[PDB]
C-alpha cells in the first residue's frame, strides 16, 4: 500500500533533479549563446535568487499545508519548465532576472516534496521511505553531473544541447507529478521548544553555516571561470560536481554509521570541521592553480555536509514528526535572512559591489568567525 505513492514520488524526484546542465550554467551563460559579462552575472542576475527565495518561502510553506502537499508539487513541476524555457530561448540581462525569480519558486517549493510523504504513508514506514526519496535525489544529481562531463568531453555536445536534455528531464518529471495520490490530511491546517539549550545552540550553527553554504555554491562557478576561462582551457565542472556530491553523500552516511555521543565530542567536531571549511575557502581564493581550486571545493562540500548531519541529528532527538517542519522551517528561513543581509552588502550592485576575486576572502573569513564565537563562547 506504501509502494505506489513512493514509487511515483521517487520517480518524480529522480527525473526532476537529473539536470545535466546545472554545472555548465555560467560557461553557458557567458558564452557565444547568451554572452553576458561576468559583472552582469555576479552582481545583477545571481543575487536575485536569494531575494526571491527569501520572499517566496513563508507563503509557500503555509500554502503547502492548507492545500494538501501535492498541488504545490505540481507548481514546482511547472516552474521547472518555465525556468528552462527562458534559459533556452530567453536572452538579455532582464530576462535572466526573471529566470532567477522562477528558480526561487522551484527551490522554495522543495518543502512540499519531502513533507508530502508524511501525509500519505503509514507512520511506521516514515524513516524507511524518507531514505528512499532522499537518496534518489543524490543519485540523480551525481548521475546527471557525470553525464554532463561525459557528453561535453567525449561526445562534444554544445552547452545548448544540455538545456534541451535538462528540459526534457524536468518535462518528464511533470508527468509523474500528476499521478501521486492526493493526501487527505495535512499537519496543522487539515489534521517555546527553542528554550531547550541544545535545540537553540545547535540551530544557530545550522542557520549560520547553511547561510554561507548556499552563498558559496551560488558564486563558485564564477571563480572557476575567473581562474581559468572556459573559452581558453578545458573546464571539468561536471566531474568535479559529481565527485563533490558523492563525497558529501558518503560523508553524511559515515556520520550515520559511527556511534559516538555527539554531546561531549559534538561542539569540538563542529569547530574543527568549521575551521576546515574556512581553511579550504582561502585556498580557493589564494591559489592560481585551477586544480587546487577544485580540491578546495571538494573538501568544503564534503566537510560541511559532515556537520549539517551532526547538527540535524542533534536538533532532532526529541521533536516529533509534527515539529520538524516548524523547527526546520524557521531555521531554513532565518538562514536566508542572513544570506540576504550578506548578499546585499557584499555582492549586490547597490551594496559594496565586490567582484568575485575578493569575495572568497570574505566567505573564507565568514567561516573563520563562526568558529571563534563558537569556541571563545566556551569560557571558564
Amino acid at each position: 500500500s506504501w509502494i505506489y505513492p513512493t514509487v511515483i514520488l521517487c520517480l518524480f524526484g529522480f527525473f526532476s533533479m537529473m539536470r545535466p546542465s546545472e554545472p555548465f550554467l555560467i560557461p553557458y551563460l557567458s558564452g557565444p549563446d547568451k554572452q553576458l559579462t561576468s559583472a552582469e552575472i555576479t552582481n545583477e542576475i545571481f543575487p536575485v535568487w536569494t531575494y526571491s527565495y527569501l520572499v517566496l518561502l513563508l507563503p509557500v510553506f503555509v500554502l503547502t499545508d492548507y492545500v494538501r502537499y501535492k498541488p504545490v508539487i505540481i507548481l514546482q513541476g511547472i516552474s521547472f519548465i518555465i525556468t528552462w524555457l527562458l534559459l533556452l530561448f530567453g536572452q538579455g540581462v532582464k530576462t535572466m532576472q526573471v529566470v532567477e525569480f522562477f528558480y526561487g519558486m522551484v527551490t522554495a517549493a522543495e518543502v512540499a516534496y519531502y513533507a508530502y510523504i508524511y501525509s500519505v504513508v503509514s507512520p511506521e514506514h516514515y524513516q524507511r521511505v524518507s531514505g528512499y526519496c532522499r537518496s534518489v535525489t543524490l543519485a540523480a544529481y551525481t548521475a546527471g553531473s557525470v553525464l554532463a562531463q561525459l557528453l561535453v568531453s567525449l561526445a562534444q555536445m554544445s552547452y545548448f544541447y544540455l538545456n534541451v536534455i535538462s528540459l526534457a528531464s524536468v518535462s518528464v518529471a511533470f508527468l509523474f507529478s500528476l499521478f501521486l495520490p492526493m493526501p487527505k490530511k495535512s499537519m496543522f491546517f487539515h489534521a517555546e521548544c527553542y528554550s531547550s539549550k541544545r535545540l537553540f545552540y545547535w540551530s544557530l550553527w545550522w542557520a549560520f553555516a547553511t547561510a554561507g553554504f548556499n552563498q558559496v555554491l551560488n558564486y563558485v562557478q564564477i571563480l572557476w571561470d575567473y581562474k581559468a576561462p572556459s573559452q581558453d582551457s578545458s573546464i571539468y565542472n561536471g566531474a568535479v560536481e559529481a565527485i563533490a556530491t558523492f563525497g558529501g553523500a558518503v560523508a553524511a552516511f559515515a556520520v550515520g554509521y559511527v556511534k559516538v555521543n555527539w554531546d561531549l565530542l559534538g561542539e569540538l567536531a563542529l569547530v574543527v570541521f568549521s575551521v576546515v571549511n574556512a581553511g579550504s575557502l582561502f585556498l580557493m581564493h589564494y591559489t592560481a592553480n585551477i586544480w587546487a581550486c577544485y580540491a578546495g571545493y571538494l573538501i568544503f562540500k564534503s566537510s560541511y555536509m559532515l556537520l549539517i548531519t551532526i547538527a540535524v541529528f542533534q536538533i532532532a532527538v526529541n521533536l516529533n514528526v509534527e515539529r520538524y517542519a516548524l523547527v526546520f522551517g524557521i531555521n531554513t528561513f532565518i538562514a536566508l535572512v542572513i544570506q540576504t543581509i550578506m548578499t546585499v552588502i557584499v555582492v549586490d550592485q547597490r551594496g559594496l559591489n565586490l567582484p568575485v576575486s575578493i569575495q572568497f576572502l570574505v566567505y573564507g573569513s565568514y567561516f573563520a568567525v563562526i568558529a571563534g564565537i563558537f569556541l571563545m563562547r566556551s569560557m571558564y
Partner: nanobody, 122 residues
C-alpha cells in the same frame, strides 16, 4: 534604434582612430552597446562593450589595452578609441545595441549598425 556608424578610413600602422555610433530613434532603452568586427574572409568578432546605465566595460582579450569604449548618453553616441593599429586590424566594424526588455530571440543584441570600413595599410 537606428544606429549609424562613421569614422572609418585607412590609417598607417600606429595611428589611432575614433569611431562613433549615433544611436537614435528609441534611445530611451538601450542597456548596452558593443562594437563588433568582421575581417575580410572571417566572421563577426567581439571587440568591446559599454553599459548604458553605468559605465562597465568588457573588451576582448586580444584587443584589450588599446581599445577604449566610452558612452556619451547626452548625444547617444558610443565612441571606440583605438591606438597602436597594425595591418592585421583591417576589417569592418559594427555596433550592436541591446535595446532592453523581456525578449526571446537568437542574439542578445537586438539592433545592428550598417558598418564602417577600417583598412590598415601603408
Amino acid at each position: 534604434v537606428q544606429l549609424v556608424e562613421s569614422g572609418g578610413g585607412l590609417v598607417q600602422p600606429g595611428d589611432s582612430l575614433r569611431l562613433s555610433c549615433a544611436a537614435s530613434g528609441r534611445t530611451f532603452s538601450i542597456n548596452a552597446m558593443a562594437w563588433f568586427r568582421q575581417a575580410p574572409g572571417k566572421e563577426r568578432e567581439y571587440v568591446a562593450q559599454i553599459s548604458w546605465t553605468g559605465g562597465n566595460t568588457y573588451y576582448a582579450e586580444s584587443v584589450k589595452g588599446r581599445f577604449t569604449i566610452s558612452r556619451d548618453n547626452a548625444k547617444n553616441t558610443v565612441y571606440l578609441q583605438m591606438i597602436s593599429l597594425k595591418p592585421e586590424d583591417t576589417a569592418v566594424y559594427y555596433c550592436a545595441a541591446d535595446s532592453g526588455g523581456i525578449r526571446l530571440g537568437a542574439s542578445r543584441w537586438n539592433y545592428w549598425g550598417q558598418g564602417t570600413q577600417v583598412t590598415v595599410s601603408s
